[PDB]
Design an enzyme around this catalytic site. Structure first.
Site, PDB file in Angstrom:
ATOM      1  CG  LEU A 104      -2.021  -1.157   1.319  1.00 19.38           C
ATOM      2  CD1 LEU A 104      -2.555  -1.098   2.739  1.00 19.38           C
ATOM      3  CD2 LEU A 104      -3.252  -1.018   0.424  1.00 19.38           C
ATOM      4  CB  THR A 105       1.465   3.753  -2.635  1.00 19.08           C
ATOM      5  OG1 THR A 105       2.231   2.899  -3.484  1.00 19.08           O
ATOM      6  CG2 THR A 105       2.021   5.168  -2.705  1.00 19.08           C
TER       7      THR A 105
ATOM      8  CD  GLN B 193       4.539  -3.990  -4.553  1.00 15.60           C
ATOM      9  OE1 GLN B 193       4.277  -2.819  -4.353  1.00 15.60           O
ATOM     10  NE2 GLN B 193       3.629  -4.884  -4.946  1.00 15.60           N
TER      11      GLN B 193
ATOM     12  CE1 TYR C  41       2.318   2.960 -11.234  1.00 20.40           C
ATOM     13  CE2 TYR C  41       1.872   1.012  -9.920  1.00 20.40           C
ATOM     14  CZ  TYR C  41       1.658   2.347 -10.186  1.00 20.40           C
ATOM     15  OH  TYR C  41       0.783   3.073  -9.408  1.00 20.40           O
TER      16      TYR C  41
ATOM     17  NE  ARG D 253     -13.553  -9.226  -5.367  1.00 19.60           N
ATOM     18  CZ  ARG D 253     -13.126 -10.366  -4.818  1.00 19.60           C
ATOM     19  NH1 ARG D 253     -12.961 -11.451  -5.559  1.00 19.60           N
ATOM     20  NH2 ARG D 253     -12.880 -10.428  -3.512  1.00 19.60           N
TER      21      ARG D 253
ATOM     22  N   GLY E  31     -10.701  -6.944  -3.024  1.00 20.52           N
ATOM     23  CA  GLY E  31     -12.122  -7.009  -2.741  1.00 20.52           C
ATOM     24  C   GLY E  31     -12.561  -7.966  -1.655  1.00 20.52           C
TER      25      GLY E  31
ATOM     26  N   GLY F 144      -5.851  -5.154   1.692  1.00 15.74           N
ATOM     27  CA  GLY F 144      -5.318  -3.801   1.617  1.00 15.74           C
ATOM     28  C   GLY F 144      -6.066  -2.796   2.479  1.00 15.74           C
ATOM     29  NE  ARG F 145     -10.056  -1.142  -1.012  1.00 15.90           N
ATOM     30  CZ  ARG F 145     -11.131  -1.328  -1.765  1.00 15.90           C
ATOM     31  NH1 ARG F 145     -11.909  -0.291  -2.088  1.00 15.90           N
ATOM     32  NH2 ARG F 145     -11.410  -2.541  -2.214  1.00 15.90           N
TER      33      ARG F 145
END
Ligand SMILES: Cc1cc2nc3c(=O)[nH]c(=O)nc-3n(C[C@H](O)[C@H](O)[C@H](O)COP(=O)(O)O)c2cc1C
Length: 381
Positions: free
Chosen positions: A24-25, A98, A179, A266, A297, A318-319
């Site tokens: 996560l940036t 990463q 990227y 997704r 997701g 992630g979130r």
């Protein structure tokens, strides 16, 4: 009883559970892209995830495209990372770096000497890019010369050396989300006529050259790779995505890597998208025999189901991990999830970063204690 919470053996790495902190940036590096004690606390707070994968970390200034992301190409940066890995390891966690190169997803204002971003082909991505001097349209990148590919592969190798010195357990090659390496894979963005273009084995050649170089630094079982098999993110497009990735994943499976990390279609980079697709993790489980991380997701129940039906071995969040540093304990205890606040994802300070609460305040105390012990160990006297 949740398999999400079962300990897992990643070829000698004894993970506390089957959940992964997704990369996560967060754009919170210190000067000259150097991690700070604040970043050490953030990762130490999240040490209860079985495996942490760091935010993307550029292998060169040429590989950056967003403000204040950390690097791994100077000793000053390595020394800052040492606090991060020290704090995580004192909390008995496990952490991979990463390795990043944004390719064309950058702006000359980020680049050394105001040079253009580099890419396989001189196609700009449709969209706008944030720069130090405001939002701006994307520039047409410079297409890389044949002789310059080995140069960038060598940047990955030096970054791996630096990651090992900083004390990371392993490294993850970012090969997703539009990227540099993803740009080489797809023919909407690859348009070379040399051996790095045309053939599906030509468009993947760079990815396998990177793997070769970093596997001279880390054993292959400590090198992971991340792919986004079917996303429109950052103007990506390929003529035969089912063909392209079937080969790559099958070719990857014989490389004896730490793991393959797949992003669900997704997800469109950092936001959800309504998209029907066949190239999800169920599709690639048979084609890869090693450890498979699925990402994008998931909730508690859907991530749990992937593991029960053996469609993956590990699930990345992630979130939810931004907002719930103790996500595994919340799942085990059936506790509410803190909601994630998107306005504090990128840039800023402790707000929306290290101030999300824990179920157990002793967890928060211990993360703080190791962040500050880590700074005392590795302080720049
Ligand atoms: C704020 C933010 C930063 C992200 N940074 C990265 C990154 O640096 N590298 C990467 O591969 N993915 C990155 N992602 C994609 C996530 O790793 C993940 O795939 C995405 O958030 C979907 O997973 P989720 O539904 O659990 O959040 C980022 C996503 C978000 C929302």
């Amino acid at each position: 009883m949740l398999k999400l919470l079962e300990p897992f053996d990643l070829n000698g790495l004894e993970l506390a559970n089957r959940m992964v902190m997704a990369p996560l940036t967060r754009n919170r590096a210190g000067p000259r892209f150097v991690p700070t004690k604040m970043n050490a606390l953030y990762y130490a707070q999240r040490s209860g995830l079985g495996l942490i994968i760091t935010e993307a970390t550029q292998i060169s200034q040429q590989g950056m495209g967003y403000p204040d992301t950390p690097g791994i190409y100077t000793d000053e940066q390595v020394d800052g990372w040492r606090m991060v890995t020290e704090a995580v390891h004192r909390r008995e966690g496990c952490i991979f770096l990463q390795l990043w190169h944004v390719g064309r997803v950058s702006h000359s204002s980020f680049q050394p000497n105001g040079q253009l971003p580099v890419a396989p082909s001189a196609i700009a991505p449709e969209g706008e890019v944030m720069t130090y001097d405001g939002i701006k349209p994307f520039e047409t990148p410079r297409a890389l010369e044949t002789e310059e590919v080995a140069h960038i592969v060598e940047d990955y190798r030096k970054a791996a050396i630096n990651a090992k010195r900083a004390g990371f357990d392993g490294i993850e090659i970012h090969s997703a989300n539009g990227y540099l390496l993803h740009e080489f894979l797809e023919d909407g963005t690859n348009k070379r006529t040399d051996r790095y273009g045309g053939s599906i084995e030509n468009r993947a050649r760079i990815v396998f050259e990177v793997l070769d170089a970093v596997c001279k630094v880390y054993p292959s079982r400590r090198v992971g790779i991340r792919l986004s098999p079917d996303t429109e993110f950052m103007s990506m497009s390929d003529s035969d995505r089912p063909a392209l990735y079937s080969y790559l994943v099958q070719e990857l499976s014989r490389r004896e890597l730490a793991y393959l990390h797949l992003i669900e279609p997704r997800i469109k980079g950092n936001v959800d998208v309504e998209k029907e697709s066949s190239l999800n993790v169920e599709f690639f489980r048979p084609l890869y025999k090693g450890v498979l991380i699925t990402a994008g997701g998931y909730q508690k129940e859907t991530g749990e189901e992937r593991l029960q039906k053996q469609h993956a071995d590990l699930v990345a969040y992630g979130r939810w991990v931004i907002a719930n540093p103790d996500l595994p304990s919340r799942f085990e205890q059936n506790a509410p999830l803190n909601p994630y606040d998107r306005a504090t994802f990128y840039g800023g300070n402790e707000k929306g970063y290290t101030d999300y609460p824990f179920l157990d305040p002793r967890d928060s105390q211990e993360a703080l204690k190791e962040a500050e012990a880590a700074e005392r160990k590795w302080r720049r006297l």
